[PDB]
Structure formats: structure tokens, C-alpha cells
Symmetry: C2
């Protein structure tokens, strides 16, 4: 039920190394946080005329915001994916679908797989306000990191 | 949830690392026995060691003539990656819906903060669907008796000749 311009709900989740990462504590850093969701690592990504696996999610690293990618996988699975695309950021899993529901970002069914997070993005201001939002009911609809990054660099220099 | 020894194992059908439907009794119709290697989570410290061992002990597992089927609650995608990771030969089924772990009563109430996880278990269901080997650990760090697993396995493929 989280909507743009509002106060982003706080959650706590285990990262690749089972080290719990709290959102609000991340905000306390003084820069917006980019929360990218996704159904499950090592999955495909359709592009209208080009369907591959190649993950461009590592692009967000360029952005001058804290990046926290969330998936319903496990820390071990995610820990693997982090090494794959040499992701330099933190990936949090929600094996219990606790946080995905909080943002209503979830596929009640995806190829027989239930409670699978859908694609989406939420740039949260260092104060906890949703300064940006993007979501798609399409599982293979990958975000265009190019802009999401600049739209974050904006939100950053926006409220400094 | 009562997969007692001697009593027929509940038939089921799950995906594949390649999203291919697999059916228990169907696969048993091949004539060889089945081995259900349950495991908590792919890319886990012990899980990998276990299946890795299952990959390295096929010399005696193949002359046993059977059908090995590992299974966890990870997505078909996490699993597919796990296979080529250690280049396994047998199929890896996913129970993303906690269906076969609740059925075969081998689920961890909680694990490292994670809920509903397949304990580490190895069942050997002979063609006639009867369960002959039931090894279930309360501690995810305990490995099964790999040697005997193959030993008591061929002990079924033989009796069928």
C-alpha cells in the first residue's frame, strides 16, 4: 500500500551473509536508498526483441544512493548472485515474504511459484519519504537503470 | 505426513532445474528404485558437500541402476544454477510451495531465521512405492551415510533380478 510522496515502511532483513540490514538505519546515512525488487535471481529478463539472462542491475551502483535489492530467495542463493554480477551493493532476501507484502509488490503466482516478488523500484528520501516509484506486473520487465540512477542522483542532490 | 518405513511413499510431481514436470511413481515405472535427497538450501555449506558427494559416488550409484532426485524449496532457477555449479547428473526438483516437505514430514520449523525449509533427508522408495530407507536429521549439518545409501540402494535393484 506504499505510495509515492509518503513515508516508506521500515523493515529488517538478512543480507548475503545473514547480517541483518535495517532500512531506517540505512537512511540515517544521509542519502536516499534505492530499493529494487525482483522475483528470483538467476532468472531471465525479456526485452521485447531481446530476451537474455544478462543482469544490468549492477548499474545502480553508479547512483549516489544506497542500493538494497530485495528478493524472496535465500542468503546463500543471493550470496552467489552477488559474486556472479560482481554486485558491489547489498542484497536482502525475504524468504518469508514479510517485506514484499508490506509494499504489495508480489506475484500471487508465477509459473506455479507463489508469493514471488514482482519487479519494482522505490527511491526513499533520507527521511523516509518515497521520492520515486516504478513497478510492473510483468516478471521479465527489467528496470532501465540508466534513468533510475539519474532520477536518484536528482533525489539525492534534491534533498541534501 | 506419515511416510513410515514399509508404507508406500506419497506420489508427487514437481518442476525441474529446467522447469520440466517430474512424477514419482511415473519415474518408478522405469523399473529402478528412487532416491529423494532432500536438502535445506542450494549453495549452502553442507548442502553442496552432500550433493557433491552424490556426484562423486556415482561409480557405485550407477551400477545400482536407480533414479536419484534431490529436492529443496528453492526456485527452479536457483536450482538450475546449482546443478551446473557442481555439474550434477541427476535432476533437482523444487518445492517452492512446501508441498513435498509437509507431505514427507521433513521440514525445519525454522532455520537461521528462515521458515519452512526442507530438513536433510534421504528416502529410498522401491518400484512398488514402498519406502525402504528413511534417514532424517534434526541438525542440517549432519551428512547421511553416503556409502550405505548406495549400498542399501543396489540392495533393491538386485532383489529385482
Amino acid at each position: 500500500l506504499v505510495e509515492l510522496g509518503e513515508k516508506a515502511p521500515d523493515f529488517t532483513l538478512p543480507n548475503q551473509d545473514f547480517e541483518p540490514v535495517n532500512l531506517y538505519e540505512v537512511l540515517k546515512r544521509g542519502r536516499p536508498a534505492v530499493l529494487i525488487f525482483f522475483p528470483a535471481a538467476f532468472s531471465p529478463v525479456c526485452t521485447k526483441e531481446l530476451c537474455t539472462f544478462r543482469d544490468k542491475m549492477a548499474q545502480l551502483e553508479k547512483a549516489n544512493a544506497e542500493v538494497l535489492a530485495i528478493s524472496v530467495d535465500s542468503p546463500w542463493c543471493l550470496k552467489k548472485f552477488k559474486d556472479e554480477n560482481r554486485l558491489a551493493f547489498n542484497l536482502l532476501s525475504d524468504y518469508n515474504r514479510e517485506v514484499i507484502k508490506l509494499y504489495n509488490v508480489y506475484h500471487e503466482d508465477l509459473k506455479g511459484l507463489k508469493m514471488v516478488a514482482k519487479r519494482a523500484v522505490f527511491i526513499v528520501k533520507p527521511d523516509g519519504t518515497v521520492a520515486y516509484k516504478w513497478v510492473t506486473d510483468n516478471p521479465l520487465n527489467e528496470p532501465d537503470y540508466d534513468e533510475v540512477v539519474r532520477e536518484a542522483n536528482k533525489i539525492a542532490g534534491e534533498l541534501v
